[PDB]
Write a protein that binds this ligand. Structure first.
Ligand code: HEM
Ligand code: HEM
Ligand SMILES: Cc1cc(N)nc2cc(-c3cncc(CN)c3)ccc12
Ligand SMILES: Cc1cc(N)nc2cc(-c3cncc(CN)c3)ccc12
Ligand SMILES: C[C@H](O)[C@H](O)[C@H]1CNc2nc(N)[nH]c(=O)c2N1
Ligand SMILES: C[C@H](O)[C@H](O)[C@H]1CNc2nc(N)[nH]c(=O)c2N1
Ligand SMILES: [Zn+2]
Lengths: 413, 410
């Protein structure tokens, strides 16, 4: 590969130069002859495999704290090596763990919120041994991160993977999500996105209230054991009823959402170590709720009902009734969150921050991996500054990765 | 290897095999994806294999592969490259190559229409006057009094690179843009340079907001010459709004015919440096990009002011409101004047249908999600949820440099 790669902004003319891509680690799935950039997703490491992955990471850490080549550096190297040699694995120092998590966020190509990356509260939970303990750590995470509506980004890191027969897993895709109930007639009550997991919970013994906005239980797996159900204390689940500053009838739709977005099904990879349970949280960009959660056909799909109350012509598409309802819904979502002093960012403020962020990164770091297909908002794309920004996409480590759903791989005891 | 694309809304999966047939490069590598880069970056000896590939594809298309006709065509083309360092397409070939350059345009959402293309052979052209004649005929035909018709006009192929044919306008019909002494811009800011270049060539600028630019035409590598498109051939629409009486008072208008004129058509190794093609508009092209881009007409603030919207915080989403309204007026206006147009909902529907057609009968369809997904209300259109595979098939449309950056004058 050539040393320098240039990206252009087509509305400001600014040109950046990327050299960081030279540290890329994994294959993107793209080739010389095909681009998989809109594909959503394009047994443990051996001693030999782990050795250089650990060294790669350790060198990077010591270079970050400006101690590269130092005695402490060479010693840490030697200690990691012995520990891999005799135990087939190694343990991170607290400093390294914090660094690793922060940088995995810093490296998340698909995240528009990464200007905040270095303000992340890390909760070390590698001493956890049971599902009840996981429940304890998750409740503390939720309470701290929620902070009465003044949200704070956090990650809780459970023990790494060992032989793969003892994984810690949060079976929920997010710590907080609403149930979906398939009806005998084909309709879905609540959130259709969560139907599969809800059925799992019910089989596992969950008594469902069978409502439209029932918070799902946590389904938690420690040390490779069968998962166990716990109810999140309702007082820890901050929620916002959705109203509209102009449309008084909007409240009569009975919509609400939860304040804390906390993805819990991803895998954190640091120096070749695999943390299969690492729930992390920030705060919402309005569109994640207002456009996706609410207006996706396979989600709450309320465009129709909202358009009706707006008395729009719904017989032509060229009326753009859908487009018109979408904006109002998103206005209500931002309005309700701000009114209740719960942290939320609109897609304009977010994409502008991110452009500023990306610029700083290119200048101080020599680059910033970004996935345009994900970075650009799902509404009003071209009137946000990221639309016109060229991005390069590539995989740096430490990183967050997808993993299979645990019910597909789990060996039931 | 076969490749699967999934639609996450319908859960439908299609299997791509056609991608095995490309040879050109996309710009990505295994380690870096450049899917969001706008522009990633002959001889006798190079020419024949390219020719052989295209001839083979053609006779395969008409189910006469390995036929007598096929065999001789191939030798005819080899002898001609041998003895002239180039060759000339048959008319049938020219037509087949042009339709398939459109079929292979990964960034074009309108490709369901692809085999409905009127192909104008202008390869006998020699002067800028001829070009102008050919272009007026195109414009008049494709406009069709509002019932627009897809068309392309193909001027002589590149020979030695010293004698290119070029349409220096980026589109046949665009409005002028003027640098105002106080720093602002009158008209269309995307065209300020080209406008100054016309003024420098002797064009007398009305210095208004919607001045149709002259044709600047280059033939056989000569200096370019100015021509005024007869006004009655230029179909335009005054933009008004079905609810907002005051929208007409903004004085806004646009042209009915989108006719891109600065790209390059490549067929079997031949380069057609001048090949204006036109179709009809998707609403958002005018209503989102042309009017609301900051480096364009930048009219969002004006419209939102008449709507009496709170413009003090971004989170009131006033920009998003004005945007939808502008795009309503645009669709309304065209349809009222019976000028062909398509809204991004219907267009994206059509395209998902096209993909299904193309996977079924052709084993795939190249597509650029970055460009295919509309610049407003993305995820409430079906293409947002459609995985797409991009790859470059030939015959094709490519980009070329602006001719003023290369041309040595007189
Ligand atoms: C603090 C405010 C944050 C904002 C505004 C934000 C914004 C976003 C948005 C809009 C997405 C796309 C989500 C979707 O379309 O479903 C996203 C994805 C993502 N974010 Fe951030 N995020 C924030 C915090 C964080 C934190 C704290 C982390 C990790 C430490 C993180 C890591 C990620 C990752 C890994 C993805 C990709 C998820 C996937 O592919 O499924 N984000 N973010
Ligand atoms: C018939 C109705 C058509 C519609 C509704 C349509 C729609 C579009 C749109 C919205 C774009 C994106 C352009 C942009 O955002 O700047 C595009 C791109 C493109 N179209 Fe189509 N188009 C049509 C016909 C055609 C025809 C007739 C041709 C050629 C014979 C064509 C070839 C292309 C090419 C080569 C691009 C890529 C332009 C670039 O890369 O800059 N299209 N089309
Ligand atoms: C940290 C964080 C913050 C934030 N505002 N949104 C997120 C959204 C996701 C996310 C990714 N894929 C799917 C979903 C569920 N539709 C959510 C993950 C993490 C997020
Ligand atoms: C055939 C055709 C039809 C249509 N409706 N729009 C087009 C738009 C373009 C196009 C592509 N890139 C840049 C521009 C100028 N902003 C225009 C090219 C051809 C088009
Ligand atoms: C940087 C980015 O590639 C650029 O803004 C692209 C994004 N997608 C686009 N899509 C379309 N249809 N037209 C465009 O001009 C662009 N611009
Ligand atoms: C097909 C496509 O990759 C898929 O629909 C993606 C597109 N971009 C996205 N962007 C974000 N932020 N979130 C998403 O879920 C998606 N979905
Ligand atoms: Zn790619």
């Amino acid at each position: 590969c050539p040393r320098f790669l240039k990206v252009k902004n087509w509305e400001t003319e600014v040109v950046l130069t990327d050299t960081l891509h030279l540290k890329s680690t994994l294959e993107t799935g793209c080739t010389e002859y095909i681009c998989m950039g809109s594909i959503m997703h394009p047994d443990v490491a051996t001693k030999d495999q782990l050795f250089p992955l650990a060294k790669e990471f350790i060198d990077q850490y010591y270079s970050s704290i400006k101690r590269f080549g130092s005695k402490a550096h060479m010693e840490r190297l030697e200690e990691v090596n012995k520990e891999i040699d005799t135990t087939s694995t190694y343990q991170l120092k607290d400093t390294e763990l914090i660094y690793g998590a922060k940088h995995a966020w810093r490296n998340a190509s698909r995240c528009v919120g990464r200007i905040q990356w270095s303000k992340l509260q890390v909760f070390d939970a590698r001493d956890c041994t049971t599902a009840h303990g996981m429940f304890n750590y998750i409740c503390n995470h939720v309470k701290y991160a929620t902070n009465k509506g003044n949200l704070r980004s956090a990650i809780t890191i459970f023990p790494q993977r060992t032989d793969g027969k003892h994984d810690f897993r949060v079976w929920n895709s997010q710590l907080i999500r609403y149930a979906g109930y398939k009806q005998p007639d084909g309709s879905t009550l609540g959130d259709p996105a969560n139907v599969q997991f809800t059925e799992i919970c019910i089989q596992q013994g969950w008594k469902p209230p069978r409502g439209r906005f029932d918070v799902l239980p946590l389904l938690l797996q420690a040390n490779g054991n069968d998962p166990e159900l716990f109810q999140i204390p309702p007082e820890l689940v901050l929620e916002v009823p959705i109203r509209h500053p102009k449309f008084e009838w909007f409240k009569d739709l009975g919509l609400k959402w939860y304040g804390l977005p906390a993805v819990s099904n991803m895998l954190l990879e640091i120096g070749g170590l695999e943390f299969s349970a690492c729930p992390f949280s920030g705060w919402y960009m309005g569109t994640e709720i207002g456009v996706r959660d609410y207006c996706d056909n396979s989600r709450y799909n309320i465009l129709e009902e909202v358009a009706k109350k707006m008395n729009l012509d719904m017989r032509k598409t060229s009326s753009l009734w859908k487009d018109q309802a979408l904006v109002e819904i998103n206005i209500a979502v931002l309005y309700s969150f701000q009114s209740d002093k719960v942290t939320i960012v609109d897609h304009h403020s977010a994409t502008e921050s991110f452009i500023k962020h990306m610029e700083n990164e290119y200048r101080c770091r020599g680059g910033c991996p970004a996935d345009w297909v994900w970075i650009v908002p799902p509404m009003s794309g071209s009137i946000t500054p990221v639309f016109h920004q060229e991005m390069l996409n590539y995989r740096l480590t430490p990183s967050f990765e997808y993993q299979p759903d645990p019910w597909n791989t789990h060996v039931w005891k």
